[PDB]
């Protein structure tokens, strides 16, 4: 597979004049006040991923954030309350148009219990995704070549699989639930930056 | 205090040309493919108050489903995620336009972890709300007074409720999640009515 | 109210010409093989009782057996799982034709999860009983008024509450359910007296 | 092993002249309210099973039907509490004569907490039951082969479990107790559909 | 009632002429490496109590040590699994011949799980102790005449207690049992002493 | 007793040229990035206490700031692991000469697990510290009487209550562990800051 | 490993004029009351064991128990809580001189919270014991040549494991410890069949 | 590798004329009160070890304790809180200039909560660590060759560890923060001595 690797932001927006992209980032950890966002990584479907490496204290990516404000444009992620959150957190833009596979698993495997990525991508599309054996210092100023692939691998096959959740959500006509779902996760996550990360703001207690 | 006590369905709508309406059920339990609707409650927050009897296999009430159904009208609740689901699984007809004085409380009263509408009047408006020292038979053909006033208190206050949760939303800055949030309810009811009441659709595990 | 005390047995079946009998125990406690029958108590309805105390190491009691025994005459408890593990493991009859008030109220009173007796005598007759506030030996030779009291008081309702409760299982169209669990009730209790008391033999794990 | 797969329906019942049928099936959840029914597996007890094909909404599969309510014939079970409830809910016919593999595991299997049909087949038979590689889609229009292999499998050895346990529940003098809670088990799945699915309804709490 | 206060030791064994002896202690907490002994408490069985202010650091108690290690005198205990682990650890020496009305609490009121000294004092004595209110500094120089009352309370009772428990264990036949695990109590707290405190040394895990 | 209310800062050091002031503060919750300070109290250990409401983004109380920064004086709080980290998310300056009541209760009240503040009052004091038991909004513009008053008991015993934990930290021998534990106290609620606030950094696990 | 398997009881005592004989058995399961014992297994200590079949409803065996009962003839089991305990229920006989080699673990081996017999053997003895992959029918008729083997080992180490520990015990000065938890063992396995099974009776609580 | 195996103590301190020395310990347990020091394992952070034997009742080791006393020598440890415990109850000294990888990897590995020496070195060095299959009889006369080898492999690291951790800490800007809980670990462990060692001294509760 060809990744791209690049400092800071895309180059430019050449390879995005499309429907939909999958997202993915990685942080130093699950606290976006305390653990800073260090690499995102974007894909157009195709056989190819885009890394980009974030440096500490940026505030700032224009071509990226291009992409995440357009409304034309679903941004597909794998549990994307956390992206959402650490997106917004270190850019300032909240996307608004989201396709989010877990809560798809959520609401069409029922048969399972299980709704990580690799279990979707081994049951979906007899992919077979390695996931790393350790975790790394994503901060390093240098990614070794199994990290840009692991980072790659983690966004290539979310079209596909938003494609197959489109059908089983018509096929069990639940198109509408998803919907609504999508449109307020934007809002859980604005619901986790304000505070409320560790409550299910609906639950009786 | 005057509650007006009907069979069925009210006789007309000219007690509710008004812009907002608090509304209350009674069940035979939590569980709404199990335990039918036996009482709704609505107040127009002029200190009377009207409690219906819905009758064993009831299908039908006009003129309480025209005003449920009217978007102009916003709907009071205390924990509506229940009362939407049961009314919906009633009559056929999900309210769409709510305000839930339970989301606001845990967006407002953030300096406590109790969050029921007996403390909430409490501490807002020093009213005793006093509580049934037992359950009761809901279904039975005819209501005791202790059984219709217990019922009326439920619905007396929230109105007064609304108006100062909505001056705290605003003083903290938060009126854009409550309004997300409130906009979510009725497909957080749905998902209850479909099958997911037990799962946080948004938790990652 | 006149309550008769006996030892060892009934002397005749004079007062127990009837349709139901009330029955309850009292125990050195909750396992069968450990803690022997102390007390045998009986209700014809009529607001009298029958307060029968049994010595240790007694194995005969005929005329209540006789009762025990009679398929003409339904037995009424509350919680008869125990009751009958604890009677055929002391006297070698195990009651077939039974009533619960406890699974009636689990089948019934589906709006509450407080299903002891002090509650269902509250809530269905407005009548307060009155539990001991310590404990006692009841494997004493004479028992203290007090004693005998409360312990009549265990039995003398429970005709009332069969009534109510097959009131409401006809309204809400429970009455196979009800049988069914009432036949089953017996060998419950063998299967308690064979080793499985913790186990529920249904459950998935 | 001759599979032969079917949509609706047997064509006939030429196969199933016999004593005693084994019944599984395959649902898209544990929920039956939520999850319909995908497949029916049967076996008369020889080298080969067949596997009907439920379509979405159907209420009717008359041959299929006829089997379930032979009295004349034994339906063998693993944990028959689900198959039952969804059958029930599905056909609208509660079949009542059953034999389930793992109450009697659990009456006689004493010596082990591990009562899943692959290890008692593996203790009882020798025989190795290989399990599902991934929770496939059971709503699939064309079952694979691996599906359709792992299907018959759940149906082609109840008959010989069902000799076994039969020999030591005379061996260990618990026929009664067997016949009892298999005679209750129709009655438990019934509850499960009428809302008791996560209440013993003989405990005390 | 007569209460004695001593700095130190007994002056002499005159008042303890007797075949048992009622002992109980206070510290400044439950664990016996930390918290030094502060008081002794003993009784004759008679309507008087002697209470033994221990000095910190005090090593020896020559009169008490000499009544603790005399095996002819029975020491009653309440829980003395505790007390024989601090007399030990403070004076060197450990009693070997003793009674506990815990145990024989647990031996023989089965028909109840509340064992505490208070409970059993108001069930087979009908005699109410009041309990401090707040737990106080032991060590103080100068002890409250509220405190000595309440120190001497503990320990008035315990001979009445041992004979009613001699009863009731002759009576259920568990003499034997009872007296074999008072044999063991001192082992039980060498144990603990010996670093064992939060284990059970007989459970399988 | 006399309660001096300020809106933003003391108006000068005059009643503060002391060796040690108590200090606790009011919040709108437990979260110190989402919920505000609202009101700082302060006592010279007199019969008098200085209530300082703080106002909706305040950044700078330079008279507070000033005694809050000074190492001359210590600083005694109760539980402040609390009020050092909001009072240094507040103001900037987190105060490095401190002293808290409740390692000190832990640290000598080895005899109880009540170490709250209304707990140590009544046993060290014989004061009765009635809670408002109501929780109100203390972001109010105008505090009522109550909440004054209310707010006011919390500092006026902390002087006390210091000087007889130093007694008896003195007594047994723990004088250098209290100070090692001040010590650090300061960065623990730094710690808190930073995102540990959930973890005992010094646990194995 | 000869292994000599018998029906019933021994020939002979010709193997066993030994002081100390090692002890294991099989049953149907944890609870004597309900499991049947099905095979004890004894060792002289040399390379071979004995494996005596036990009846169904088998009273006496009288070889066995003379072993059992001699006083001078020290039984070794691992975990003998429930050994002694099937044993006296069996046969009536509790044996009162024990060793066992899971207490002696728990006294010596303190680095560890591993103290099943497969981890003492290989740790003690560099001996890999293969245990069950699957319980088996202990009372089949005819016992599998695996299944004998699989009982045998059970038995053919404690000799070698009972002088290390020994050892152990003397090098840590823990005599004296071991030997009262020995002869208290057989009173903890009389409470068990009494009924205090699931009960530490030297508990607080 | 090189490893120096030493009886008491080391001879002198030729091959330790460094900056900081990388410690650990090996006892029989984790509760010093009880579990004897046995084994002290040192290292220059070169490629050699030095395993001293401690033997039981030893008081003193001169040249260790001269080493563990000088302050221009930071001792690295994992995990110190422990280390520091039982070094000062053998020996009576307290180290007070310490590093403790097990702390610095909370503050900077916040991508995983599994921060054991096995997993550190795995991610930061690509050094795999084989551990024993169980633990060990550390006070055995004569250790065995792989013992030796375990015991040098925990110290061979831990110097590399500190300069990569440091690193880190500075990168992240927690060098303050790490030094200020490494001045408190001493004090930690002497908490742990004291009998604290169950309690967050400084948690709510």
Known sequence: ?????????????????????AVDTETL???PH???????????????????????????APN???????????????????????????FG????????????????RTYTDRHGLKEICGELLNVNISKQQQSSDWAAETLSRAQIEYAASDVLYLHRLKDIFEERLKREERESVAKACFQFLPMRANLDLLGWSEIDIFAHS
Chains 1, 2, 3, 4, 5, 6, 7, 8 share one sequence.
């Open 29 to 31: 950890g699950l606290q």
């Open 1 to 21: 597979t060809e990744i791209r690797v690049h400092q800071g932001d895309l180059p430019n927006l050449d390879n995005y004049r499309i429907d939909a992209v």
């Open 34 to 60: 305390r653990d800073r966002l260090c690499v995102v990584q974007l894909s157009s479907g195709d056989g190819t991923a885009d890394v980009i490496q974030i440096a500490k204290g940026q505030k700032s």
């Open 64 to 90: 990226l954030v291009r992409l995440l404000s357009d409304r034309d444009i679903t941004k597909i992620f794998h549990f994307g309350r956390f992206d959402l959150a650490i997106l917004a957190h270190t």
């Open 93 to 108: 833009v909240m996307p608004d148009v989201v396709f989010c596979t877990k809560i798809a698993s959520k609401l069409t």
